[PDB]
Amino acid sequence: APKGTIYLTFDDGPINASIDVINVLNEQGVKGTFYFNAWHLDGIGDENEDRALEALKLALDTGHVVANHSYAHMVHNCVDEFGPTSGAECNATGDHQINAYQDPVYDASTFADNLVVFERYLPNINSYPNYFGEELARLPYTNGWRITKDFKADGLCATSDDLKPWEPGYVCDLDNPSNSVKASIEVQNILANKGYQTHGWDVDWSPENWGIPMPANSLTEAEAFLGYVDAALNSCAPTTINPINSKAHGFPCGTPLHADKVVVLTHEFLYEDGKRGMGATQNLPKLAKFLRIAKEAGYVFDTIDNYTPVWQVGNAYAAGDYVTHSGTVYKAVTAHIAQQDWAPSSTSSLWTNADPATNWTLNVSYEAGDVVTYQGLRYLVNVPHVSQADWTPNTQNTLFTALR
Ligand code: NA
Numbered sequence: 001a002p003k004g005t006i007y008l009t010f011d012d013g014p015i016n017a018s019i020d021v022i023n024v025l026n027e028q029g030v031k032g033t034f035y036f037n038a039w040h041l042d043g044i045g046d047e048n049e050d051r052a053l054e055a056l057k058l059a060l061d062t063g064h065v066v067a068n069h070s071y072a073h074m075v076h077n078c079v080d081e082f083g084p085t086s087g088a089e090c091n092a093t094g095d096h097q098i099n100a101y102q103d104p105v106y107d108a109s110t111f112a113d114n115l116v117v118f119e120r121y122l123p124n125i126n127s128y129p130n131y132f133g134e135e136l137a138r139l140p141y142t143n144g145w146r147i148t149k150d151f152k153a154d155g156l157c158a159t160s161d162d163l164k165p166w167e168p169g170y171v172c173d174l175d176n177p178s179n180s181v182k183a184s185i186e187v188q189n190i191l192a193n194k195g196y197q198t199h200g201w202d203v204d205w206s207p208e209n210w211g212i213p214m215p216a217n218s219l220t221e222a223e224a225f226l227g228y229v230d231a232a233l234n235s236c237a238p239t240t241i242n243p244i245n246s247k248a249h250g251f252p253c254g255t256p257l258h259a260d261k262v263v264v265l266t267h268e269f270l271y272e273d274g275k276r277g278m279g280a281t282q283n284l285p286k287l288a289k290f291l292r293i294a295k296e297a298g299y300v301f302d303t304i305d306n307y308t309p310v311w312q313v314g315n316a317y318a319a320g321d322y323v324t325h326s327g328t329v330y331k332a333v334t335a336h337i338a339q340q341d342w343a344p345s346s347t348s349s350l351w352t353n354a355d356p357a358t359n360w361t362l363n364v365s366y367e368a369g370d371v372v373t374y375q376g377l378r379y380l381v382n383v384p385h386v387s388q389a390d391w392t393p394n395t396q397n398t399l400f401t402a403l404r
């Protein structure tokens, strides 16, 4: 009977600072989820990153989950031509969020480049069960979600075509958002069709003021931050969160998978003594205190791969329960006790596939109004039905109509 589940997630590693963050976590047995960019492994990410490969190894060997944050954090969209100094050059101008997404197909493909680079530096990385780079992602700058067919959100103010959010003159038009936001959405949809889930966050453990001379020194204290977590528990934090560009618009408040869960976003580089402040000296103790008080307050920690629980032999499932099985999201059709010979599948009558994907897919519960893509063409679902191999969109003229 825990008060809730916290998902500690760390963005933008692997860097030298990741090693200290992991050792703090390890001292208390907590597992984190790390959303890595492989450009630190190549030494072009403008951080202290000579130990990036040791950090990647440490994360995997001590049981933390590694997920896909893209190769270079979309920095290629921040400069005219991407190269070894694009990182520092984009740091100099601070325009990370300006035209952050441009060509969605290419931007998505940098999530796959990420995988290739990981495997070049750590060639046996897919022999690790806690390596999830092919299945779990998070978009840079974007509190966007792709969890189930019916659990999606987009961060409609996350990135801009011109003005930064705080800057005088900034308007975010939700009914017609920035071109960069529009591309980020297509990127979400592209990753979901390759089988990813993308997760945003409920709370962003960040500087209480990004304007003071050493911003890392103003990271929220642990007591105050456990307070933020308490506040977000079952209160649809992704929509209420500030600033505006951190919001997740359309988040399905009260959706069952999000009950009693808080996903915390933070960055290893905030726990480093360096160009941003006394991270290691002042904030590593804050992190270690939070881990103590959060358990005392009744929370437990988990990693994002369990956010949707894995299908288990012997569990009682209710109609409507969500699981993953071989990385695929499923929704129980019938209350029943799972057993070894009837796991979810593309022909199971006990489950339907509920991936957040939009390509036409077997054993999906389709609704009137859904749109599916099949053999390069888009089709509207006219009639609710569970899809099967006899009823491919191109030949079933009753259940589907081509958009043309
Ligand atoms: Na798998």
Ligand code: NA
Binding pocket: 135, 195, 196, 197, 327, 328, 329
């Ligand atoms: Na998946």
Ligand SMILES: [Zn+2]
Binding pocket: 011, 012, 069, 073, 140, 141
């Ligand atoms: Zn990031």
